[PDB]
Amino acid sequence: GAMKDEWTGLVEQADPPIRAKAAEIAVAHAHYLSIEFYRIVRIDPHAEEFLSNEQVERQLKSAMERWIINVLSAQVDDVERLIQIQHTVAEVHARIGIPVEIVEMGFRVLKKILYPVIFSSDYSAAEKLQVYHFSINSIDIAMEVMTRA
Amino acid sequence: GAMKDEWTGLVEQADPPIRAKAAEIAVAHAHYLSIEFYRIVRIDPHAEEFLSNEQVERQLKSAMERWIINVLSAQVDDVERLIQIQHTVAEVHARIGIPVEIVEMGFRVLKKILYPVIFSSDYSAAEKLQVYHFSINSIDIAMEVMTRA
Numbered sequence: 001g002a003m004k005d006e007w008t009g010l011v012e013q014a015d016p017p018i019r020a021k022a023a024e025i026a027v028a029h030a031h032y033l034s035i036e037f038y039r040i041v042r043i044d045p046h047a048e049e050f051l052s053n054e055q056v057e058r059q060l061k062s063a064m065e066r067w068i069i070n071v072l073s074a075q076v077d078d079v080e081r082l083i084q085i086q087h088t089v090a091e092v093h094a095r096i097g098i099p100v101e102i103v104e105m106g107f108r109v110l111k112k113i114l115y116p117v118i119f120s121s122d123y124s125a126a127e128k129l130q131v132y133h134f135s136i137n138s139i140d141i142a143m144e145v146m147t148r149a
Numbered sequence: 150g151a152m153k154d155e156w157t158g159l160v161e162q163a164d165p166p167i168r169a170k171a172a173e174i175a176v177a178h179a180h181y182l183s184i185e186f187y188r189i190v191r192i193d194p195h196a197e198e199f200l201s202n203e204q205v206e207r208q209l210k211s212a213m214e215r216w217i218i219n220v221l222s223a224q225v226d227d228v229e230r231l232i233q234i235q236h237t238v239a240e241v242h243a244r245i246g247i248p249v250e251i252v253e254m255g256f257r258v259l260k261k262i263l264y265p266v267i268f269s270s271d272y273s274a275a276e277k278l279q280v281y282h283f284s285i286n287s288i289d290i291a292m293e294v295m296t297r298a
């Protein structure tokens with residue numbers, strides 16, 4: 001697909017030190033990010049409806065942590081598997097009955113809380129920019145795959 | 150609204166010199182951005198349908214320039230007016246019959262081509278990071294307002 005070629009290209013184009021630091025950010029903070037994501041998303045009245053028990057909370061947080069690491073640590077050979085995952089998540093969101101714009105709001109929250117983590121790192125400003133750029137484009141590409149399903 | 154408070158907060162949190170350079174990038178390069186946006190979007194078969202004549206092309210490019218400048222140059226007192234703008238655009242997209250994932254794809258294209266423009270500026274790496282961050286968050290918050298229709 002066209003999305004596969006873009007995602008693959010994005011990963012292939014990124015230099016090893018940048019992909020390495022993107023993976024570092026993900027692994028180091030995915031747990032924190034998943035917790036903050038849930039807290040902020042819960043505030044939204046239209047989103048709070050879908051989060052009504054500790055089992056859902058536990059499952060979503062673990063799933064979000066896994067998602068963040070998988071996307072940001074993506075290798076070229078992971079792309080095809082990553083694409084199928086987005087389809088799977090879309091199916092689940094569809095069955096639960098979660099509106100696309102509610103999911104999009106989730107992506108915005110994620111991209112929002114990801115930045116201070118990269119900003120507070122000890123990387124150079126040039127490194128922070130490229131890591132954040134790689135991260136944003138990766139998340140947006142994943143969002144498009146998920147929503148176009 | 151909660152959306153107004155979020156957009157307001159985003160502008161309030163970004164230091165004046167950073168928002169200033171974001172506005173500078175927008176005005177100086179809105180023309181390039183609108184043209185390249187149109188070219189890339191046209192490649193998508195599902196989006197090419199909505200762009201079938203020179204009158205629409207011409208008006209859309211002009212509309213995009215204004216949109217980019219308005220969003221990236223957002224002041225606190227502009228937030229309320231900007232929200233109404235996104236609603237208006239949403240109405241137009243709805244009447245024409247443009248799918249949400251097609252619009253979302255447009256936003257991804259815009260964010261994608263914005264980065265090399267910021268990267269190519271003569272600002273410091275630290276400035277580029279903060280300008281790019283403000284820009285991404287601004288475009289994303291605007292997209293959510295639009296998609297929430």
Ligand code: HEM
Pocket residue numbers: 041047050051055056057059060063064067088089092093096098102103104105106107110
């Ligand atoms: C307001 C936004 C969102 C809400 C309310 C929401 C809600 C949910 C819920 C309730 C589940 C099932 C939990 C369970 O199994 O008990 C789920 C599944 C999942 N979500 Fe979302 N979601 C949102 C957005 C997102 C975003 C932005 C991502 C990734 C960037 C994401 C990734 C996933 C994953 C990986 C799963 C599990 C997939 C599976 O079980 O096969 N979600 N979501």
Ligand code: HEM
Pocket residue numbers: 190196197199200204205208209212213216237238241242245247251252254255256259
């Ligand atoms: C694939 C993506 C998109 C397609 C195919 C598309 C298509 C169109 C078309 C055909 C029009 C009619 C313009 C006219 O006839 O005068 C329009 C209006 C407009 N679009 Fe979109 N659009 C897309 C995404 C976007 C995005 C991402 C933005 C902003 C970030 C945007 C902003 C606007 C604005 C400001 C107008 C005119 C508003 C008005 O007339 O009041 N569009 N769009």
